[PDB]
Design a protein around this nucleic acid. Structure first.
Ligand code: XZ4
Ligand code: XZ4
Ligand code: MG
Ligand code: MG
Ligand code: MG
Ligand code: MG
Ligand code: MG
Ligand code: MG
Ligand code: ZN
Ligand code: ZN
Lengths: 367, 182, 367, 182
DNA sequence: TGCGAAATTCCATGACA
DNA sequence: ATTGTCATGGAATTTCGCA
DNA sequence: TGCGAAATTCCATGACA
DNA sequence: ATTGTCATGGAATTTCGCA
C-alpha cells in the first residue's frame, strides 16, 4: 500500500518499469500495459490472489498465471505463482512427474555359478494337478533355471523346493522381490542356517528381479506354445520346459545355460561335441575362460530430461496401491543416501528409512 | 579314445529297505562315473515306477548317455527299458551276481552306505530331511585320485560349502552300542 | 542321396564349396569344416531335422540354427530354418513382435463446436449418492466438457444424459469406443432419430478416444485433489469440476474451452475482459479467427524399426482377453484395405471384415 | 457504454403449474438477455429449493453477472439471495406488479408460452420429454431484429438443427376444440 | 545496439481400466 | 467402416526495460 | 584384390501380475 | 540396505567362395 502510493505520484520503485503510467481508478492502482489495463494489487493481497486463481482447477504454472493476468499485473508474477505451487500439498501428491528416471544400471553378471540365485513365483495359473504356482530359480551367472510347482507362493513351499535344489549346491546369495514368501522370518532363518545371504529388490520394482522375470517370460511363452489347442495341463510340462530352456542357445552369448553351468552338453538332442577330444580338465579350463568373456551390456544413454537423485533432495515415493480418486504420490521426503544412481534411502512418510528405486520416486517440483 | 566326461555314464542302484522316514524306505543312488557326483532320491519301493519318477527329476537337469545298473528287477523291466529308449539313454547291465562298476564309483558307493549308517544311528527315521546335506558332503569330498571334488569336476568352480571337517565315517564306540540295540 | 553321391566322388554341386573334403564315415556323408566335422544330411531329411531342432524350445532363427550346427551342415541352413519358423503355427501366434507401429496420426481438430462429440465412461468409482460412473462428453473443437453421474455405463443412462445435453445443441457426429453402452441398437436408433452420425473407435484402442480419455485424466486428477483428506464424495463435485475444467487455460492454446465455445468468459473468477469494448458481432468475428488459428500438432518421427500396413500383407490381430498360458495373437489374416497408415480392414480369423488399429496388429514374421 | 454480451443478464421466471409430466409441474425459464438463448428446467414446485437445484445445473456451464426476475417468492428468499451471493451473481428484481424485462426477452417468453401451449394439447402429460426439442426450436428461431438466431449469437456458428419450418404457433381450429375440453 | 533479466515458448514425460 | 491427447515444469528461446 | 552371396552380428521391440 | 533382461527377426555388417 505504501509501496504503491509512491508509484502513483510518479516515483520509481524497483520492479515496476518507469515507462508506464500508473494511475488510480475506482480505489485500485492500475497500469496501462500492452495487453490492456490491469490492476496492481498491494503486496499483502497477492498471495491470496495467486491462491484463488490456482485453486479454481489446481492448475500449474502457466494455466494459473493466465488466470491472474486476466485482471492483475505485478512484478514477477510467476515467481509468486511457483511459490504457491510448491506449497500446494494436493498438487504435489497428485500431479504426475515430467522428468524421467536416469538410465538403468546393468549390474555385472555374477562371476561363478551359484554366486547368486534369483527367485520369484509365477502365478496364479490354471489349476494343474492341484498346483497353481511355479517357483522359478535362476542362477545369475549361467541362466540355468529350476522349476518347482507349488500350491501357494508360500515360505513353506519355497523352503521345501529349495531344500531339494540345494542338494546339488548352496548359493552365496539368493535374490528375490519383497513378496511374502521371501521376507518372512521363517525364510530368513532357513537361509542363515545354510550360510545364504538374502538380497531383496527395492519394493514394487520387478526390474530388480529382471533376471528371473525375463526367464518367467520364456517359461510362459514355451508353456503357451506346448499347450496350444490342449487343456492347460502345465504340471507335467514343467520338467520338459525346464530341460528345454536350460539347453536353449542365447544368440548373443552363443551358449546354453546348461553349457555355462557344466561346460559340456548332456545327452540332449543336438548335443555340441566340439570338446570331445579335450580332457575334462582342459574342458573346464575352456569353460572358465568362456564364463569371463561373456557379453555384458552397458548403461544406455540417459533420456533428454532425466533426473538423478542428490542427497538432501526432496523426492516423493509412489503410492503402492492407490485407491480410486486418491493421490498417486506420497508426501515429500528427503534423500538420505544415494546407494547408486538408481537406488536411494529416503526418510519415509512414516518416519522410517526406506530403500526405494528411483523409478518409484519423483523429484518434488518447485523445490 | 575320447576322454571320459560328465554325463557319459550314470551308475544307479537302490539302498534299502531303510527305517521309514516320512513314508520313504529306499534311496535311489545315482553317481556320475566321471566326476563321482552323487544324487540321492528317496523312494517308497525299489520299483520301476519309483525309479522312473526319481530319474525324471534328474533327467530334467541332465541326461546321461549310459545308465549302468545291476540286473535288479526295477532296472531290467520292459517299462524302464521303454523309458530309457524314449530319452536316448543306453541301458548297460552288470553280469548277474558279478556287480562291477568302477573303482571311483565302488568307493563312492561305499562312502554313501557308510555315511548313511553313521547318521542312521540315533535318528533312524529322520534321514529324509538329511539327504540334502548328505549329497553336499558326498559331492564336496576330496578325491585323492583326481585331486578334485565331484562338485569342482562337474561345475569347474570351488564350492560355497567346502567340507574340510571330515567325519570319522566309522562308528564311535557309543554309536556301535546304540546300533546293536536297533 | 543321389545329390550327395556325386559329391563323395569329388564332383561339384552348386551350394557345396569345392575347397572342402566331403567324405563318408559310418554311413553318413560328412564334411571337414572349420568348426569341426559336420554331417551333411540328404535333402529329404533336412526338413525333419530343422523341425526337431526348432521344437525343443520353439526357438527363433539363431537359437534353432545353433542347435542344428552342432551336428549338421548343409547349404543355406538358415533358409530352411526360416521356412519352418513361418510354418510353425505356435510360434506365429505366441511370439511377440519386434517391429513397432508406424507413427501416430494427429487428426485435424473439428472445425466448429458440436461438429464432433467424444464420449466415454469413467468408472467404476467409489459409490457416491448411489452413483458409480461418470458419462464424459467432450466437444472436439473446444474441449468443452459435460459431466453426468450414472449408476451404470448403460445405454439408458447415456440416452438420458445426452437428451439433457442435446437441449443446448445437436452434434453432427458422436465418437465413442466400442463399449456396450454405445454399440447397442437402442443407442443407434437414438442417434439416427436426431440426425447424429455414430463414429466408433477401432476395438481395444483407447488412443482413438484420446480426446475424452485425456479429459478423463484431468477430471480424475482434479477430483483427487479436491477429495484429499476427505471421504470420496465425488457426486457433488462433478458440477464444480465441470465448471473448473471448462474454464481452465490450455497453455499451448492460450484459451479455455469455455472461451473457444462462447468467445467470452461468463461470471467466473478471473474472467477475461479483453473484448469488453467490442460488440458481440465483432467478438464472434474474433472468435471465428481464433478457432481457425489454433495450434495443431504434426505426426511425430517414425521409430527406427516401424512397420506400415500394405494391402495383402499377412498380419495378426492381438487377442483381446487372452487367457492364462494362451497365445496373445490370432492366426494370420490378410489386410483388405488401408484406411490410413494406422487403420486397416482385415479378413478376420472368423472370416469377417474387421476394422482394427495397427497397434493391435503385428506383421506375420518370415512372410 | 460497453456493448451487451452473453451472460450479462439472465431473465428467469416460472411457467406453471402445468399438467403433471413424469412428476414435474413447473418449468423454470432462463433467457439470456443479449442472445435470447433459452434454457428450460422442469421443476416440481416454484420454490427456492427447486430453483437452486435447476440453476446449479446451468451455473455449472455459465454464470451470469445479473439474474433478473419478478418479486416471486422463490427468487426473493434469503436462501436464493445467499445462493446468488456465493456465486457473485447480482440479483435484480422488477417492481411488484410491474414486470419489465426487455423487448427481446418479452417476445421470447411469449414464444415459449405459445409454443408450450401448442404442444400441450393432445398430450398434456408428455411435455417433460419434449423440453429438449422445445429449447432447440426456441434457440434456432430466426430473430428479425438481430438477424441471427440465439444459437448463432451464443456460439458464433450455424446450427446442425436449423428450424426453417416454423410452426403456426397459433392453435388450429381442431386444437382449439380439443383444448376447450381440457 | 546490447546487456541482464523477465517473460514466453518449447517439449519430454506420463496417464487417461 | 477410421485416426491419440494435453497439463506439466525445467530448459531453451525470445522479449523487455533500459541505455 | 574384388565381387555377389551367405553368414554373422547388430539391435529396437516388447514382455516378464 | 541396492542395481533390468534377453529372445526375436529384419537390417547392417562382415566373411566366405571364387577368381
Ligand atoms: C510395479 O509392479 C508391481 O506392482 C509388482 N508386481 C509384480 C510383478 C510384476 O509387476 N511383473 C511385471 C514386470 C514388469 C516390468 C518388469 F521389468 C518385469 C516384470 F516382471 C512380478 O513380476 N512379480 O513377480 C511380483 N511378485 C510379487 O510377490 C508378491 C508381487 C508383485 C509382483
Ligand atoms: C487396450 O486397452 C483396453 O483394453 C481398453 N480399456 C479401456 C480403456 C483404457 O484402456 N483406458 C486407458 C488408456 C490407455 C491408453 C490411452 F492412450 C488412453 C487410455 F485411456 C478406456 O479408457 N475405456 O474408456 C474403456 N472403455 C470400455 O468400455 C466398455 C472398455 C475398455 C476401455
Ligand atoms: Mg514376485
Ligand atoms: Mg515376477
Ligand atoms: Mg541293486
Ligand atoms: Mg470406454
Ligand atoms: Mg476411457
Ligand atoms: Mg414469476
Ligand atoms: Zn494445487
Ligand atoms: Zn515354434
Amino acid at each position: 500500500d505504501a509501496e504503491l502510493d509512491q508509484l502513483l505520484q510518479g516515483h520509481y520503485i524497483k520492479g515496476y518499469p518507469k515507462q508506464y503510467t500508473y494511475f488510480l481508478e475506482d480505489g485500485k492502482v492500475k497500469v496501462s500495459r500492452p495487453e490492456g489495463v490491469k490492476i496492481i494489487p498491494p503486496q499483502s493481497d497477492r498471495q491470496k490472489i495467486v491462491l484463488q486463481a490456482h485453486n479454481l482447477a489446481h492448475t500449474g504454472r502457466e494455466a494459473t498465471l493466465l488466470k491472474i493476468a486476466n485482471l492483475y499485473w505485478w512484478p514477477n508474477m510467476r515467481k509468486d505463482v511457483v511459490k504457491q505451487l510448491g506449497r500446494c500439498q494436493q498438487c504435489l501428491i497428485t500431479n504426475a512427474s515430467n522428468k524421467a528416471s536416469g538410465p538403468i544400471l546393468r549390474p555385472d553378471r555374477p562371476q561363478k555359478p551359484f554366486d547368486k540365485f534369483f527367485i520369484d513365483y509365477i502365478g496364479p495359473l490354471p489349476p494343474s494337478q492341484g498346483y497353481l504356482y511355479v517357483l522359478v530359480v535362476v542362477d545369475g551367472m549361467t541362466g540355468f533355471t529350476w522349476l518347482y510347482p507349488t500350491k501357494a507362493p508360500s515360505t513353506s513351499a519355497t523352503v521345501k523346493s529349495l531344500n531339494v535344489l540345494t542338494s546339488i549346491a548352496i548359493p552365496k546369495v539368493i535374490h528375490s522381490d519383497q513378496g511374502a514368501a521371501f521376507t518372512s522370518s521363517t525364510f530368513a532363518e532357513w537361509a542363515k542356517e545354510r550360510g545364504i545371504h538374502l538380497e531383496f529388490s527395492t519394493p514394487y520394482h520387478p526390474q530388480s528381479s529382471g533376471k528371473v522375470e525375463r526367464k518367467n517370460s520364456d517359461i510362459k511363452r514355451l508353456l503357451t506354445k506346448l499347450l496350444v489347442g490342449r487343456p492347460t495341463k502345465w504340471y507335467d510340462l514343467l520338467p520338459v520346459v525346464q530341460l528345454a530352456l536350460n539347453n536353449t542357445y542365447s544368440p548373443v552369448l552363443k551358449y546354453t545355460p546348461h553349457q555355462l553351468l557344466f561346460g559340456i552338453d548332456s545327452n540332449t538332442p543336438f548335443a555340441n561335441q566340439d570338446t570331445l577330444d579335450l580332457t575334462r580338465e582342459e574342458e573346464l579350463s575352456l569353460l572358465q575362460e568362456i564364463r569371463t568373456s561373456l557379453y555384458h551390456p552397458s548403461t544406455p544413454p540417459a533420456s533428454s530430461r532425466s533426473w538423478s537423485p542428490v542427497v538432501g533432495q526432496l523426492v516423493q515415493e509412489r503410492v503402492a496401491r492407490p485407491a480410486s480418486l486418491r493421490p498417486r504420490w506420497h508426501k515429500p521426503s528427503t534423500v538420505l543416501k544415494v546407494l547408486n544412481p538408481r537406488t536411494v534411502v529416503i526418510l519415509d512418510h512414516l518416519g522410517n528409512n526406506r530403500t526405494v528405486s528411483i523409478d518409484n520416486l519423483k523429484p518434488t517440483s518447485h523445490q | 579314445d575320447r576322454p571320459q566326461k560328465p554325463f557319459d555314464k550314470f551308475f544307479i542302484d537302490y539302498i534299502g529297505p531303510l527305517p521309514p522316514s516320512q513314508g520313504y524306505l529306499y534311496v535311489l543312488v545315482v553317481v556320475d562315473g566321471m566326476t563321482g557326483f552323487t544324487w540321492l532320491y528317496p523312494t517308497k519301493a525299489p520299483s520301476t515306477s519309483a525309479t522312473v519318477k526319481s530319474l525324471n527329476v534328474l533327467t530334467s537337469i541332465a541326461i546321461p548317455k549310459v545308465i549302468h545298473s545291476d540286473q535288479g528287477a526295477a532296472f531290467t523291466s520292459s517299462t524302464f527299458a521303454e523309458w530309457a529308449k524314449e530319452r536316448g539313454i543306453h541301458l548297460e547291465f552288470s553280469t548277474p551276481y558279478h556287480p562291477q562298476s568302477s573303482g571311483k564309483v565302488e568307493r563312492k558307493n561305499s562312502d554313501i552306505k557308510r555315511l548313511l549308517t553313521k547318521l542312521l544311528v540315533g535318528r533312524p527315521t529322520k534321514w529324509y530331511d538329511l539327504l540334502p546335506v548328505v549329497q553336499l558332503a558326498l559331492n564336496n569330498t576330496y578325491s585323492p585320485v583326481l585331486k578334485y571334488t565331484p562338485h569342482q569336476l562337474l561345475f569347474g568352480i570351488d564350492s560355497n560349502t567346502p567340507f574340510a571337517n571330515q567325519d570319522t565315517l566309522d562308528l564311535t564306540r557309543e554309536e556301535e552300542l546304540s546300533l546293536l540295540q536297533e
